[PDB]
Amino acid sequence: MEVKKTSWTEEEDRILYQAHKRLGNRWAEIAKLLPGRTDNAIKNHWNSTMRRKV
């Protein structure tokens, strides 16, 4: 079965956070550097992992 786990690499998350503040909330453009990862997946990851508690 294998439950849908957050199969994100530390590297991806690193670039994600770096880009988020450097480029901005330009998720559409950030995916240019992080292909495959869709906006919904990125944001889902961003809200669940990074902004787990604000």
Curated annotation (Swiss-Prot):
Domain HTH myb-type: 4-54
Location within or outside the cell: Nucleus
Record note on modification: SUMOylated by TRAF7; leading to MYB transcriptional activity inhibition.
Transmembrane segments: none
Residue ranges of DNA binding: 27-50
Superkingdom to which the source organism belongs: Eukaryota
Purpose: Transcriptional activator; DNA-binding protein that specifically recognize the sequence 5'-YAAC[GT]G-3'. Plays an important role in the control of proliferation and differentiation of hematopoietic progenitor cells.
Oligomer and partners: Binds to HIPK1. Interacts with HIPK2, MAF, MYBBP1A and NLK.
Entry note about domains: Comprised of 3 domains; an N-terminal DNA-binding domain, a centrally located transcriptional activation domain and a C-terminal domain involved in transcriptional repression.
Protein name per Swiss-Prot or TrEMBL: Transcriptional activator Myb
Classification of source organism: Eukaryota, Metazoa, Chordata, Craniata, Vertebrata
Full protein segment contained here: 141 to 193 of 636
